[PDB]
């Protein structure tokens, strides 16, 4: 079956650090897993208007390829947003 493994995306993580990690993120995926993005804010309930949302939507969008999210969350749990990221679902 497909499994739940997880990246994070931190702030601060950015192109550099950042779409490294986002070629393990493929990885996770393309394992044939539902790669789930745990956002980590420095921040609260409503940390950020750019910290989650910068990064999880490009995360999205560079990895839309082989990749689809879930959900585009941005309701954050505590100081922190999963963004749900799955495989890309044949219709």
């Given at each position: 079956?497909?499994?739940?493994?997880?990246?994070?995306?931190?702030?601060?993580?950015?192109?550099?650090?950042?779409?490294?990690?986002l070629?393990?993120?493929?990885?996770?995926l393309?394992?044939g897993?539902?790669?789930?993005?745990?956002?980590?804010?420095?921040?609260?309930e409503?940390?950020?208007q750019?910290?989650?949302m910068?990064?999880?939507?490009?995360?999205?969008?560079?990895?839309?390829?082989?990749?689809?999210?879930?959900?585009?969350?941005?309701?954050?749990?505590?100081?922190?947003?999963?963004?749900?990221?799955?495989?890309?679902?044949?219709?």
């Amino acid at each position: 079956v497909i499994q739940v493994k997880e990246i994070k995306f931190r702030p601060g993580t950015d192109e550099g650090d950042y779409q490294v990690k986002l070629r393990s993120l493929i990885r996770f995926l393309e394992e044939g897993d539902k790669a789930k993005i745990t956002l980590r804010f420095r921040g609260r309930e409503m940390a950020h208007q750019q910290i989650g949302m910068e990064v999880l939507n490009r995360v999205k969008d560079d990895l839309q390829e082989l990749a689809v999210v879930e959900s585009f969350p941005t309701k954050i749990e505590g100081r922190q947003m999963i963004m749900v990221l799955a495989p890309k679902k044949k219709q």
